[PDB]
Design a protein around this ligand. Structure first.
Ligand SMILES: Nc1ncnc2c1ncn2[C@H]1C[C@H](O)[C@@H](COP(=O)(O)NP(=O)(O)OP(=O)(O)O)O1
Ligand SMILES: [Mg+2]
Ligand SMILES: [Mg+2]
Length: 425
DNA sequence: ATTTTGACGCT
DNA sequence: AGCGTCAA
């Protein structure tokens, strides 16, 4: 009762851009706007591989990882934008720069955690407290929440349903209580409406958001009403929401760990986890995972929003599948140089922008026939931002993988260079 | 022969 | 450190 934590101490939002790379391309090229569209990498093999899909194209069944040639079978009028190629490889600079546009806007509202190229968490707890003081007990008009869904409501047209749910929620709020978690989430949603309006006004890009008490629930909430909408998941909404929620839908449970939860416990839904003691869950999944699951299935998580707006690593990667695998020393050295030149360009820009220098170079390769994605991943010192030195050092680190008694055997099917371990500069 | 990323955990 | 998991 009075000593049972409820995980309602923070207001956390997760903002995630809608079909992000597509919107970047649609801003640049108005002919792509409001069309079935996808972003592809490469072209010669099966029309290229799709990495982002507009909602209009998703209605035809087009998905990420599809070859463009097959997507065209589902959607004959599908429009395509190609990722830039530089030095023989896909180059993601346009999307990294568009991401910075969005992150810098979000950072005006609160400190952010950059969780991917297109999404960030924000801890709105302080901002909500401030806004609740500026409010002075006044009620919250539905007009301040024009794109907000309240998960679980209404209870007892889709825009009409959205407004019915919001009306039920607001009618039940105790606006007189500055410590009420539900009121805090509501003010958080007002702030997120403002943040999302600023992103769209200042970049042209639309996004969705989740508002809840922790990162996992905010991320889950965000996807409930994509695109171009935001969703509030209250603590009270958790039992019903989790009662039919597949375990794999919760962040970190979409892979082998989640599959093992399902198999070992004989359950399907997140809510079913409440029927195990913390010790039982720790016995199956480890101390850390077990405690995390015990709290998470009750809607409780403590993972903080970390104050980090910039990536911690800067990497360059290229696969050489099938016949294109690298079988000569000239080939390996040429491609290591291509990757190192892109890396040097990005590192020099990062140093000028962000007052830091990377100090370690990680080199990773895959050899043809290896079942693992990396046959070798080894580090060396990164002492100067020079592409020829970095590529020579990478070659020195990998050269003893060549079992050729000029030739490279087995052929290399992947090269990867990554700068890590930044220090102030 | 989806690829190109990038954070964090384990030992 | 090097390897693995998870997800964008
Ligand atoms: N497997 C992959 N390989 C390469 N790039 C990928 C990728 N998955 C995503 N990206 C890139 C391209 C994506 O645009 C971007 C963000 O990924 P999301 O937020 O997971 N998906 P999006 O924003 O497109 O649609 P939604 O409205 O459902 O959020 O990351
Ligand atoms: Mg997105
Ligand atoms: Mg995303």
């Amino acid at each position: 009762g009075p000593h049972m934590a409820t995980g309602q101490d923070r207001v956390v939002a997760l903002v995630d851009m809608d079909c992000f790379f597509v919107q970047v391309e649609q801003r640049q090229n108005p002919h792509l706007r409001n069309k079935p569209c996808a972003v592809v990498q490469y072209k010669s093999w099966k029309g290229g591989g799709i990495i982002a899909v507009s909602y209009e194209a998703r209605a035809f069944g087009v998905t990420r990882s599809m070859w463009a040639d097959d997507a065209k079978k589902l959607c004959p009028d599908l429009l395509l934008a190609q990722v830039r190629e530089s030095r023989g490889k896909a180059n993601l600079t346009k999307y990294r720069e568009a991401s910075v546009e969005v992150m810098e806007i979000m950072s005006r509202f609160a400190v952010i955690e950059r969780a991917s190229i297109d999404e960030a968490y924000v801890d709105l707890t302080s901002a909500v407290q401030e806004r609740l003081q500026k409010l002075q007990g006044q009620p919250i008009s539905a007009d301040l929440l024009p794109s907000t869904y309240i998960e679980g409501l209404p209870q007892g047209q889709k825009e009409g349903m959205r407004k019915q749910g919001l009306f039920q929620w607001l009618d039940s709020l105790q606006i007189d209580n500055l410590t009420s978690p539900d009121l805090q989430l509501t003010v958080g949603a007002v702030i997120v409406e403002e943040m999302r309006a600023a992103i769209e006004r200042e970049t042209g890009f639309q996004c969705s958001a989740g508002i809840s008490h922790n990162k996992v629930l905010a991320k889950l909430a965000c996807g409930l009403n994509k695109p171009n909408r935001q969703t509030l998941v209250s603590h009270g909404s958790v039992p019903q929401l989790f009662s039919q929620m597949p375990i794999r839908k919760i962040r970190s449970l979409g892979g082998k760990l989640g599959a093992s939860v399902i198999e070992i416990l004989g359950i399907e839904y997140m809510g079913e986890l409440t029927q195990f003691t913390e010790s039982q869950l720790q016995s199956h999944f480890g101390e850390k995972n077990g405690s995390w699951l015990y709290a998470m299935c009750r809607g409780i998580e403590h993972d903080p929003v970390k104050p980090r707006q910039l990536p911690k690593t800067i990497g360059c990667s290229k696969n050489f599948p099938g016949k294109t695998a690298l079988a000569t020393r000239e080939q390996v050295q040429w491609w290591l140089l291509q990757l190192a030149q892109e890396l040097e360009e990005r590192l020099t820009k990062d140093r000028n922008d962000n007052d830091r220098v990377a100090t370690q170079l990680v080199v990773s390769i895959r050899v043809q026939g290896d079942k693992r994605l990396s046959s070798l991943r080894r580090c060396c010192a990164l002492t100067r931002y020079d592409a020829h030195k970095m590529s020579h050092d990478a070659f020195t680190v990998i050269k003893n993988c060549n079992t050729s008694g000029t030739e490279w055997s087995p052929p290399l099917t992947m090269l990867f260079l990554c700068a890590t371990k930044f220090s102030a500069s």
